[PDB]
């Protein structure tokens, strides 16, 4: 039993605060974009031949064109303005915990896992240190993961052969914190 | 190089006769409009204290999406959508400590059409205590995303599966979690 999907997006892309703004009104059928309005172009353009009838018809309606030429201001910049306070400026601290992946004796290889969870926004740096010196090799990362609820998590692992006396530090820099957070694991 | 993106995403699907209207900020959902109750649903409740939205405008948009669908189905000669089945991930939202409350997250990704049946299984039995879910979320490539949530109490004694049905899958997909 065949399915047929009609999909549309209206997109506001923001650069350098709201100094540059790009607005798109995009029309899709069954995963195929076929006609769109790009604010950098100023009229509708067919993305595929299946959208040619719409780009020609829409572009002949002059009040529609000027309506869509103002969206950058009265839709993009307006909506950024009224949601900026709880989205663009949302800051939630990461919780950092360090733990070995397996309980191992010393002088055997092991993955040292730095868990960073609950944080917003998504941009973050996680570094690994051994006795104060930064480990640039041996680092494995799951990447940034959306939890779907306005928080992120990530797992950053260090390939080690722990020896007694060694100090490993997981350091996290995020916009929500002034000072980098650091968690230690002692061998 | 862009700092942020706000996306107003909507669809209407036949023959399910099912629609969606939602807003997306940098991949997270600000809100959507419940098609049954015709009202704005904020993804975090604090959002409803900082902002408003007229749900009737979303509904008027869905009416055009519907009209556009019948027009575009005829114009394409009734070519059906190609099913793309999802990849499913299960993870917890914090590091697991035995006997301390936590949340299982079933992340359903890179699929179209935006229809799934999703079931949480605890030791093979369905569970609905405290489950929540998101609507279908947009992707740059125009496949869809969806999250399902299960509060639970970690224990050496239980095992969990997120079970996903989708028309591009020959059989239901189970994605397993245990301590």
């Amino acid at each position: 039993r065949p399915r047929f999907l009609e999909y549309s997006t209206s997109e506001c892309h923001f650069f350098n605060g709201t100094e540059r703004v790009r607005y798109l009104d995009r029309y899709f059928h069954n995963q195929e974009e076929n006609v769109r309005f790009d604010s950098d172009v100023g009229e509708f353009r067919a993305v595929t031949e299946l959208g040619r009838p719409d780009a020609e018809y829409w572009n002949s309606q002059k009040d529609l064109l000027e309506q869509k030429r103002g969206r950058v201001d009265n839709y993009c910049r307006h909506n950024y303005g009224v949601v900026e306070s709880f989205t663009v400026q949302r800051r939630v601290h990461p919780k950092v915990t360090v733990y070995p992946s397996k309980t191992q004796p010393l002088q055997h290889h092991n993955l040292l896992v730095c868990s960073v969870s609950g944080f917003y926004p998504g941009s973050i740096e996680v570094r690994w240190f051994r006795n104060g010196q930064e480990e640039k090799t041996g680092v494995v990362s799951t990447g940034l993961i959306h939890n779907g609820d306005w928080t992120f998590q990530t797992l950053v692992m260090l390939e080690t052969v722990p020896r007694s006396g060694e100090v490993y530090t997981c350091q996290v820099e995020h916009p929500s914190v002034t000072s980098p957070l650091t968690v230690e694991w002692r061998a | 190089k862009e700092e942020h993106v706000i996306i107003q995403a909507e669809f209407y699907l036949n023959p399910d006769q099912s629609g969606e209207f939602m807003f997306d900020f940098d991949g997270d959902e600000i809100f959507h409009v419940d098609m049954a109750k015709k009202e704005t649903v904020w993804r975090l409740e604090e959002f409803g204290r900082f902002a408003s939205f007229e749900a009737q405008g979303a509904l008027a948009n869905i009416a055009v999406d519907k009209a556009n669908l019948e027009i575009m189905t005829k114009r394409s000669n009734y070519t059906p959508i190609t099913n793309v089945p999802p990849e499913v991930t299960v993870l917890t939202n914090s590091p697991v400590e035995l006997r301390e409350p936590n949340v299982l997250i079933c992340f359903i990704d890179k699929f179209t059409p935006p229809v799934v049946n999703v079931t949480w299984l605890r030791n093979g039995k369905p569970v609905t205590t405290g489950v929540s879910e998101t609507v279908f979320l947009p992707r740059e490539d125009h496949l869809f995303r969806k999250f399902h949530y299960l509060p639970f109490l970690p224990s050496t004694e239980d095992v969990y599966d997120c079970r996903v049905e989708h028309w591009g899958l020959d059989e239901p997909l189970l994605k397993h979690w245990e301590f």
């Binding site: 009838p53 009224v82 | 939205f53 948009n61 556009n68």
Partner: peptide, 13 residues
């Protein structure tokens, strides 16, 4: 103030 929606254009039939 209101979060506003963008209007969807009807296609040519």
């Amino acid at each position: 103030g209101g979060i506003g929606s963008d209007n969807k254009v009807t296609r040519r039939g």
